[PDB]
Design a protein around this ligand. Structure first.
Ligand SMILES: OC[C@@H]1O[C@@H](O)[C@H](O)[C@H]1O
Ligand SMILES: OC[C@@H]1O[C@@H](O)[C@H](O)[C@H]1O
Ligand SMILES: [Mg+2]
Length: 468
């Protein structure tokens, strides 16, 4: 069967053939360089054992030689067959994934190192992750196949935080997220939320090697505005990774996974300071920017602001603070409001935000305005006094937040996409614990028309929506 072999720790990268060089790469072009045929093993066709055949050079297989990997044509020798036969076993870093144990060296596994493929003994946790792969084959969810039922297995996407999911008018969801290295902007698409798991992501932009846009790269969001694609994202500098401002990329091409992305520069606000997590929405003919920013006069890391926009590339007028940390549940670790996300429903405009540190104490609050009010008047916005989404020990989910909102494909139900960890205790600076995973669940509605987010669902299969 035809398969891609995706790295466990670099999930944007795939085992591929590069003119007979065997490596892992992202943005594999042509895509067939990353496609393999898993066949019954040359040295043993029986249970477990496979051989990994090139789709372009049939009769050529991956074989180890002096513990390095080569793509070579089967020469009919027993040594070749043994060097090209591997038992598929449960993944060494995660038994739900796959590892490839050598037929003739059964203590050695296929692993990547400096992006090249080797056959090594596996000792460290690094080794285990380097030797674990996700097999994407014909039984995997096809991201190009439409389906009105929303059934996901959470986590949908491992090790992606701040998930942004945008349902476009072409019948695809588009997803951007923070990557654990905070060093690039990643895009994927799927007609179903579950297909986001198996979709091939593309690195559409990498940070500069010095200076501006050269520090932390955080929380990109892709939007379609006035016929063009925009990515709003936050970036520090190479000399201060945390001197973060808003930046914009633009793509006029219709497919953002194949089109050309252009830097447009900084999206400036009323003053220069720590600024991040921008989103935008339209209502009654006006477009707004909603974002997080430090005010030097307020002892919080950031507050929530709204402003009218003047096209996709600027705000106009004065920015208005509509949330600042006030309750103790906004100030665990440090005082912060960030990650705004907009949901329109029932004659209201809802803005969730995240608060407290990005460890298990992370949680969400809610702002509510009437959709006929002046959205630039702070008195139009009401903050809920308690968190509206938070850790839940009984479901094993910790620090949920920086969410986005989307819908089922038929638009009839609202779905929240957010990150959380499936353990509580973090060693070290939580910013560098990479295990916030992307997941989704239904948004329920109270009789009074306000959202009920419930509690973060436990890992596993979640039936979000079946149409009537
Ligand atoms: O790659 C390890 C061994 O080195 C080579 O000599 C053999 O073909 C292979 O089995
Ligand atoms: O191959 C990519 C990385 O390079 C080496 O640093 C590591 O072993 C591996 O994770
Ligand atoms: Mg966001």
């Amino acid at each position: 069967a035809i398969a891609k072999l995706q790295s466990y720790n670099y999930s944007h990268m795939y085992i591929r053939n590069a003119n007979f060089d065997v490596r892992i790469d992202d943005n594999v072009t042509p895509e067939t360089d990353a496609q393999w045929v898993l066949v019954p093993g040359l040295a043993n066709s029986g249970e477990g054992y496979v051989s990994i055949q090139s789709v372009d050079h049939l009769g050529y297989y991956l074989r180890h030689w002096n513990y390095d990997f080569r793509l070579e044509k089967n020469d009919g020798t027993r040594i070749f067959a043994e060097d090209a036969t591997f038992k598929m076993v449960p993944g060494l870093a995660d038994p739900s994934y796959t590892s490839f144990q050598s037929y003739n060296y059964p203590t050695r596994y296929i692993r990547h190192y400096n992006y090249l493929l080797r056959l090594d003994e596996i000792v460290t946790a690094l080794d285990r992750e380097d030797a674990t792969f996700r097999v994407i084959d014909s039984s995997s969810v096809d991201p190009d196949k439409a389906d009105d039922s929303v059934i996901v297995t959470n986590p949908i996407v491992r090790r992606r935080a701040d998930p942004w999911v945008y349902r476009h008018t072409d019948g695809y969801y588009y997803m951007t997220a923070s990557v654990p290295e905070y060093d690039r902007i990643e895009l994927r698409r799927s007609r179903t939320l579950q297909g986001l798991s198996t979709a091939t992501p593309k690195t559409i932009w990498r940070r500069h090697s010095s200076g501006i846009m050269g520090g932390h790269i955080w929380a990109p969001e892709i939007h379609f505005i006035d016929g063009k694609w925009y990515i709003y994202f936050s970036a520090g500098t190479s000399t201060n990774y945390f001197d973060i401002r808003l930046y914009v990329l633009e793509c006029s091409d219709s497919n953002p996974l194949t089109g050309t992305w252009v830097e447009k520069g900084q999206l400036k606000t009323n003053w220069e300071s720590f600024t991040l997590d921008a989103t935008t929405f339209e209502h009654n003919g006006t477009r707004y920017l909603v974002w997080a920013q430090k005010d030097p006069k307020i002892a919080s890391n950031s507050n929530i602001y709204i402003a009218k926009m003047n096209g996709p590339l600027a705000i106009t007028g004065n920015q208005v603070m509509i949330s600042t940390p006030e309750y103790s549940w906004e100030k665990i670790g440090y005082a912060v409001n960030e990650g705004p996300a907009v949901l329109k429903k029932n004659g209201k405009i809802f803005i969730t935000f995240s608060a407290s540190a990005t460890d298990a104490n992370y949680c969400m609050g809610l702002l509510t305005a009437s959709d006929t009010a002046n959205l630039l008047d702070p008195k139009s916005w009401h903050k809920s006094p308690n968190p509206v989404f938070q850790s839940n020990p009984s479901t094993g989910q910790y620090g949920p937040g920086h969410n986005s909102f989307t819908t089922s494909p038929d638009g009839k139900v609202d779905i929240m996409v957010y990150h959380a960890r499936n353990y509580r205790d973090i060693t070290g600076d939580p910013l560098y614990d990479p295990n916030r995973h992307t997941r989704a669940q239904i948004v329920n509605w109270n009789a009074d028309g306000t959202p009920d987010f419930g509690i973060p669902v436990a890992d596993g299969t979640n039936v979000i929506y079946i149409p009537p």
